[PDB]
Structures are given as structure tokens and as C-alpha cells.
């Protein structure tokens, strides 16, 4: 290979000729720097975004990190729930002049959990699966909500063409310990919806998630197994 390119303060993982994972940091008292991953996709003459960076000023490194690697338009963000890791640098997105989407439910969780909301809302059909009205030119983006488990709003999205699936952080890896945060979690539907990210999208062989490197199905086994300890 190359190596994972440091650009800022972030850290690049090429996943797939056309996928790339980004990483930010933040500290936090008592256990040190926190990674966040979220995601970047380039598509027909485009790039997509998945998740913002911790900060604006780490999110507006993603942006420039994009328009030196790849050039190209960054044509939409979606943000996958209102917490700090995945929503933090909404105001650099849009200083930016980027079209940012959320679950609506993300959007009207935003205020109270600190975030700027999307500017835009996606709205999901009864079966979990993004209304496409909603969301258009997401192109190889497929979106899912699975039903509420480490937040109400959290929400997952697979890439078309790769076999990759983004459960951000309603999935922990293969060997993690707990949970993790459950202040704003469904404990009662956690497991359910855990199983259900899996159903989705059950050809991804390559599960990324939020704080950890991509794992495989276990992944979603494991997570689902430990979210069933809590109902
Ligand atoms: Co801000
Ligand atoms: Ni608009
Ligand atoms: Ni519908
Ligand atoms: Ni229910
Ligand atoms: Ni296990
Ligand atoms: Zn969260």
C-alpha cells in the first residue's frame, strides 16, 4: 500500500478505489484522544459526505482535504444523528455552501442535544428505507433507518457498488466491551434494531463504524448480542 495520509489534524483511510474513511480527534478527560469515523464518497463527477468531524474547524480539514485529493464538488452531507462526533461541524458545511440532510427526527433533536440542525430532512417509509423524494442525488448512498438504539434518530447508510455498510454508532466492534453511551439510547429496542441494520444490507461484508476500524458481520452479531443484556 501508501500508507493512511495524514492531512490537519485527520487521518484518511482509502477503503475502496471511490471510498474513503475520515477520522477526527477529540480528547477526553480521563481516557485520551477519541477517534470519530465518518465517511466520503466520490461519485459521478461529485463527492458525498458522510458525518461531519467532531469541530468545524476539523470539519472544514475534510473539505480540504477533498478539494486537494479529489476536486470535485462536494454536492451533499448526511449526518447519521445529533451528537457532537457526527454533527459537531454542521456550521462549516454550510459556511461552505454545502446541502446537508438528517433524519427530521435529528433535526428536531439538534437544539437540545447542542447541534445545528441539517438543512434539510429525510423522511423513512414504515419498511426503514429513506423516502427517495427525500433525499435526492444520494446516488450510490442507500439509507436505512433501523429503529432507535443508541439514539432515537440514529440512522445507517450502505454504499452501492462496494461492500461496505456504515452503522455509525448504533454498532460497536466485534470485541467491544459495552455499549458504550446509553444517555440517549432505547434500550428496550436496541437488539431489534441492531438486527435490523444487519437485514438491510446483507451482502456488506465490511461493517465501518463510528470509533473504531471496520470490522466484519461480527460486528453486528456481537452488538446486537450485547444490546439483548439490556431488555
Ligand atoms: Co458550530
Ligand atoms: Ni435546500
Ligand atoms: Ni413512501
Ligand atoms: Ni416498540
Ligand atoms: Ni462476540
Ligand atoms: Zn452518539
Known amino acids: 500500500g501508501p500508507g493512511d495520509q495524514r492531512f490537519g489534524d485527520l487521518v484518511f483511510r482509502q477503503?475502496?478505489?471511490?471510498?474513503?474513511?475520515?477520522?477526527?480527534?477529540?480528547?477526553?478527560?480521563?481516557?485520551?484522544?477519541?477517534?470519530?469515523?465518518?465517511?466520503?464518497?466520490?461519485?459521478?463527477?461529485?463527492?458525498?459526505?458522510?458525518?461531519?468531524?467532531?469541530?468545524?474547524?476539523?470539519?472544514?480539514?475534510?473539505?480540504?482535504?477533498?478539494?486537494?485529493?479529489?476536486?470535485?464538488?462536494?454536492?451533499?452531507?448526511?449526518?447519521?444523528?445529533?451528537?457532537?462526533?457526527?454533527?459537531?461541524?454542521?456550521?462549516?458545511?454550510?459556511?461552505?455552501?454545502?446541502?446537508?440532510?438528517?433524519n427530521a427526527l435529528s433535526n428536531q433533536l439538534a437544539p437540545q442535544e447542542g447541534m445545528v440542525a441539517a438543512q434539510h430532512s429525510l423522511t423513512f417509509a414504515a419498511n426503514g428505507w429513506v423516502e427517495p423524494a427525500t433525499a435526492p442525488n444520494f446516488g450510490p448512498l442507500k439509507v436505512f433507518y433501523p429503529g432507535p438504539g443508541h439514539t432515537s434518530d440514529n440512522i445507517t447508510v450502505g454504499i452501492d457498488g462496494t461492500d461496505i455498510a456504515f452503522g455509525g454508532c448504533l454498532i460497536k466492534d466485534s470485541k467491544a466491551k459495552s455499549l458504550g453511551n446509553l444517555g440517549?439510547?432505547?434500550?428496550?429496542?436496541?437488539?431489534?434494531?441492531?438486527?435490523?441494520?444487519?437485514?438491510?444490507?446483507?451482502?456488506?461484508?465490511?461493517?465501518?463504524?463510528?470509533?473504531?476500524?471496520?470490522?466484519?458481520?461480527?460486528?453486528?452479531?456481537?452488538?446486537?448480542?450485547?444490546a439483548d443484556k439490556l431488555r
Do not use: C
Not at 77 to 102: C, E, R, S
Not at 184 to 193: F, I, P, R, V
Not at 203 to 215: E, L
Open 15 to 102: 477503503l475502496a478505489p471511490n471510498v474513503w474513511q475520515h477520522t477526527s480527534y477529540l480528547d477526553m478527560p480521563g481516557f485520551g484522544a477519541v477517534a470519530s469515523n465518518g465517511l466520503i464518497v466520490r461519485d459521478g463527477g461529485r463527492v458525498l459526505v458522510v458525518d461531519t468531524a467532531w469541530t468545524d474547524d476539523q470539519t472544514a480539514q475534510i473539505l480540504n482535504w477533498i478539494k486537494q485529493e479529489i476536486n470535485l464538488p462536494v454536492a451533499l452531507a448526511v449526518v447519521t444523528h445529533a451528537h457532537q462526533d457526527k454533527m459537531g461541524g454542521m456550521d462549516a458545511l454550510h459556511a461552505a455552501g454545502i446541502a446537508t440532510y438528517a
Open 184 to 226: 440517549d439510547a432505547d434500550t428496550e429496542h436496541y437488539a431489534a434494531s441492531a438486527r435490523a441494520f444487519g437485514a438491510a444490507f446483507p451482502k456488506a461484508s465490511m461493517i465501518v463504524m463510528s470509533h473504531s476500524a471496520p470490522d466484519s458481520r461480527a460486528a453486528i452479531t456481537h452488538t446486537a448480542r450485547m
